[PDB]
Symmetry: C4
Subunit: 356 residues, 4 copies
């Protein structure tokens, strides 16, 4: 065969975690983790850098709950600075797991593009905790040059770069000096990249390959995109990602940007790809414009997502994420296994808060 | 370097090969072991769910030769009453104790020794120790406490889905292990937590280990059609536990209701919000009304008899020794169902 | 430690690779063998079902060059009457010039009478005797489970009593079963446990073998005895006929594609301003009212005459043989190379991304 | 036992892996070979179908850098007339179409389909100035095709000749040895095609391209991947596998330029789209049973807007792979095989689409 097929790649729906002997209840497990080599999270969730997901309200709530929000970059420098500053002056025992810097202020992230040094300058002055250098194709000279230039001017600024989906890409970014890599080419709910360009790696195999390489450098992996249910968070972490970035599951909350609207008797919010026409008009598109149901507060969403993670860790018998990653074992399943895993042969009559 | 230990299969992935047969479906024998010490005349058990089994369903299961497990979503006195109703019902296939009284089971959870005490005094035949995660310190310590206090009480524990878990429960002294993490029709465990094992591979793995102890395996959850029962027993389960196929019956708890011109009964997971009243592991639903348990069980056991006839098996143990499987594809599964023809008459065993 | 023999494939899992061809579809030969002793001029048999084959359908199947098998869900006198109607439709001494010009490929016995088959069950020796006396050309011994003592004993009794009667027996799905029936003296084995459109056996009993692998395994054993294999059930499209024959079947038995025709028994009816005929498994409750059912009761769209259906089915086979370069069915089996496909490959193979606005005569 | 040669994959079974890139999508080169002797500025060819390509579609495809193939479901004189219209096709146009695919005289290039043994048709198309003849059969790997290739190359040594369709390495070898200038690969993948269902014959398109490219490269002969392209990503996969150009039917059938009528049905505009082996197409020509259907596709506007989106997807793909040009694309490309769940992850999922996207239906 002329064509080079390197592996058969799996994603979340193709695998399940095996139960393990457990001496710990879900409410007892520890779910803190690392965002970067130098920044910890108290809970492993990050809200996506998207203009229908994270501005200051979402970033504040995510940090209060122990995680992180990344302010999107589809705004001018001054507006983004204003958003970072609003998170940073936000700060109450209602939030005992709040993720704070050494001064007691909430952590926040902010996204940047290739070559946007003036923006990096402004965000550093505004007190940003981590810069997220994002591009459709992180394994690129433009990205690596920007990494090198930022770490040369701000040696102690935590820098996350992405997105990537190969071991070669993880090595290249780790060698350029990043503090974490963000993995995900194509898995996003609103993403058409794989369909429009033919490029991508199914998300489980992409995490697995990139974690194996990035661990050789001590660099955490953020699993970005494709999370549909709380069970997918556990699988992403068990394969070895240090944290998970989520868009669609948070787009429908009070705190995300944009107003509620009603369609056919039910309430929704807009949710769209940053590579969709609408977002780019604020080169051919790699995302769509859509809607997601309204699901209330980020707090109630996060409670269900982490409840599922805790249940998963109790089933596996892990006391914390490190132990979860060391001892998780998987089985590969079939299409019929997946059908068996969902609800089947019964008509759901009541909504469940964690299953749609 | 992720640890995938196995490609795991479930019911729809496999079929039984026919073998040379000298037996007609009429003639095969379908008795089996529930526990090390209790035999069933038919290998079907109704699920311990508050939309499936109270006394009326348990009575009919035992009269037909199997067993009902009274659910534990009720206080102790209520469950004792349900047990006494079944034992008091009477005193050719009926599953009876040494006094001519129907046999019945009853579910308990961890740290419920007072419920065990009352159920034993009420004459329960078997206690079913029921957890979302059987392979845990709480369950193992509860098994050891029950067997130390009641050496001669048959104890079933679950649920599990690995060889290591079957070993642990068998070493602690259970009389049967119940296998099934995630296969249930109303179950969302695998979606909410990412954990589970497709039911065929889980039975296969647990049987191999439990056989070392002479301990039967109960295949719990995921049975959709009667062929699923045949497959589970052929792989080596000694009995099968069924929820959804029995919940739309006259005998299950709860009332008929009508929706869009046709009748239903509620059916819900014991880890759904409704049953527990939180991060649920089940949903609340409805199933079509299908008449009496008698007519359902007749169809289910009819399928099992046909299967044993096709395989040439005189009885369950011979069925397990003779069974050979093929793995099939999605195209093979579509070929197996009805295809390319519009069904006009609802068929008593295929829906 | 559960014993999985193999991964088994059915029609939609495979495709034939094109091969170098020097023949056009109108030039290929499609005659074949029904049994060791009976030839067909085309490779199609209508199912022994009370919604498919009674005398009218059997007369048409024979005129077109194949065979019809009269079902057995009737008393002996009624099945004799059906067989005689086929045997008396035509004869060597009656020069029906119309029928002889329209149907030049008609499949006839040595007296110039249309051939016909008839179904029997285990131990129905009285029915066999009456069918022989009626002039039946081949007896089809049907059971849900051909690989059984009851069937093998029936085969040995029939072959002892009528050594020259061609006898088909089924249904089977393993090589061991084919070996057992061939050693017992059958003239052809009929393969298919579970593939039928109206069949629920695999779902109700968990027992079956996907049809391509089942044919493949039984052909390899039956060929050792010179015994033809009949692929019975699960044919959805003309391409499935080609695949079945290419894998090694000598003929194919079809139910649902022939049930909605003028010639099948049963009356046209209308559902929501559309015409249908009934089509039901012989193991359905309706058919058995005459233990738990192994089929359903259904309807299929009315499609006109058996002639236009068969014309399309054989046109697809001829095309297939042209693509392989096969001059005849045995050449087809010796040339044929398959590929295994995926789910996406099956999607690609069907019509996709286009709304169909006209009925194609061979694609529904 | 039966002989299964391999497990065959098509477009939805595979994805391209990203590679290290120093190039942006607007900088990559998408020039490619049509035959041994003719190049395209862009690798797209409109299908030789009577609902896709007559002179108007061929003019636009050539103006955008590719090619149109005039279908053969018409008499010789009608097909000569369509070819002449393209060849007869002001100085502003040269500004607006700076990538036009022209012959030596500055006329738009055009192809035309012929059938087995149709030497009279070849003679008339050559005198009309056709740039390439596409010898097309349902079954290219046949004595009839092979003898016609030989007779055409004997009589017109300098006429570029594409032959198809094929799906195996043995077939590419036979056509290359008989002297074709490109082979066209595709048995069964077409949107409107029922060949694999009617006859059971075919090879999933990715494996078919891959097998034919390996053999045809030994003769320096380009492969045209014909059929089954649903999205722009499929074009990228086909080229990365080793195809030199891609032939497109359904994605161009609902354009202004395709022949046949815009009509409205239930508030939406469509155009007819049908297989050349459908009953309607063959009754036009007027015996073999059909190997295609008759349908309709939504109206999508101009060919230019469609082509812009398709090539934008190709450029993006080459940027992800790090490829500066098509040959570099093919050398660098590495694939993964995916599952049905992988394909579901790849599409839009768990969100309702509320706005039209120009490259994703
Ligand atoms: C602009 C657009 C539509 N596409 C690209 O920039 N494509 C792209 C860029 C570089 C290379 Cl070498 C190849 C392709 C975009 C915008 C915002 C987000 C994304 C996205 N896919 N994020 O994950 C994409
Ligand atoms: C309560 C709830 C919703 N979940 C759990 O208890 N989860 C759970 C328990 C222990 C551990 Cl270590 C991990 C997870 C439940 C209630 C009833 C039944 C089930 C069920 N999954 N099978 O019966 C679950
Ligand atoms: C009666 C019924 C419903 N089932 C059986 O007779 N079952 C059966 C027979 C023997 C053995 Cl050992 C095992 C199972 C039936 C009637 C007519 C046709 C079929 C059928 N499956 N044909 O392919 C089945
Ligand atoms: C006419 C028809 C329906 N079929 C054939 O000509 N079949 C065919 C020809 C030769 C051989 Cl040896 C085998 C089969 C057709 C018409 C137009 C296009 C096609 C088609 N499949 N193109 O790819 C087919
Ligand atoms: O339009 C785009 N094209 C491709 N990927 C995108 C686009 N916009 C956002 N993303 C990615 O999709 C992720 C969200 O995935 P989700 O959680 O599945 O909704 C984000 O964190 C980005 O990495
Ligand atoms: O809500 C729950 N979550 C997970 N599993 C459940 C829940 N409730 C009942 N089950 C299991 O599902 C089985 C019934 O499955 P069914 O026969 O497929 O409907 C029961 O016997 C239990 O083992
Ligand atoms: O009810 C039944 N159960 C199982 N198989 C049946 C039954 N009735 C007929 N068959 C088989 O199904 C075949 C027809 O399949 P079809 O062509 O796919 O509809 C017949 O030739 C029989 O072998
Ligand atoms: O009716 C037919 N039967 C089979 N293939 C056809 C027929 N008509 C056109 N084709 C092929 O299908 C291709 C178009 O496929 P599409 O781009 O997927 O719509 C054409 O270029 C031909 O190769
Ligand atoms: K489930
Ligand atoms: K079937
Ligand atoms: K097709
Ligand atoms: K996607």
């Amino acid at each position: 065969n002329a064509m080079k097929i390197v592996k058969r790649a799996l994603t979340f729906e193709d695998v399940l975690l095996r139960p393990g002997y457990s001496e710990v209840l879900p409410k007892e497990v520890k779910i803190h983790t690392k965002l970067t080599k130098n920044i910890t999270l108290n809970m492993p969730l990050i809200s996506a850098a998207m203009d229908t997901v994270t501005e200051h309200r979402a970033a504040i709530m995510m940090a209060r709950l122990g995680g992180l929000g990344v302010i999107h970059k589809n705004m001018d420098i001054a507006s983004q600075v204003r958003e970072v500053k609003r998170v940073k002056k936000s700060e109450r025992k209602e939030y005992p797991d709040a993720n704070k810097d050494n001064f007691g202020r909430l952590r926040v992230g902010a996204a940047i593009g290739v070559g946007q040094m003036d923006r990096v300058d402004a965000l550093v002055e505004a007190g940003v905790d981590v810069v997220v250098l994002d591009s459709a194709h992180g394994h690129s000279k433009g990205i690596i040059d920007t990494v090198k230039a930022i770490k040369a001017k701000y040696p102690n600024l935590d820098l996350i770069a992405g997105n990537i989906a190969t071991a070669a890409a993880a090595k290249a970014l780790c060698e350029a000096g990043v503090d974490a890599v963000k993995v995900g080419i194509g898995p996003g709910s609103i993403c058409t990249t794989r369909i429009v360009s033919g490029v991508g790696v199914p998300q489980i195999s992409a995490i697995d390959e990139c974690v194996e390489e990035a661990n050789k450098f001590g660099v955490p992996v953020i699993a970005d995109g494709g999370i549909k249910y709380s069970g997918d968070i556990a699988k992403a972490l068990a394969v070895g990602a240090s944290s998970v970035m989520i868009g669609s599951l948070l787009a429908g909350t009070d705190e995300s940007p944009g107003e509620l609207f009603t369609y056919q008797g039910r309430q929704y919010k807009s949710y769209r790809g940053m590579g969709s026409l609408g977002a780019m008009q604020k080169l051919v598109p790699e995302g769509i414009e859509g809607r997601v149901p309204y699901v209330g507060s980020i707090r109630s969403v996060v409670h269900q997502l982490l409840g599922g993670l805790r249940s998963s860790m109790g089933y596996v018998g892990a006391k914390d994420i490190e132990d979860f990653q060391k001892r998780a074992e998987f089985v590969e399943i079939t299409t019929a296994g997946l059908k068996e895993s969902h609800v089947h042969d019964v008509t759901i009559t009541h909504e469940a808060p964690n299953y749609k």
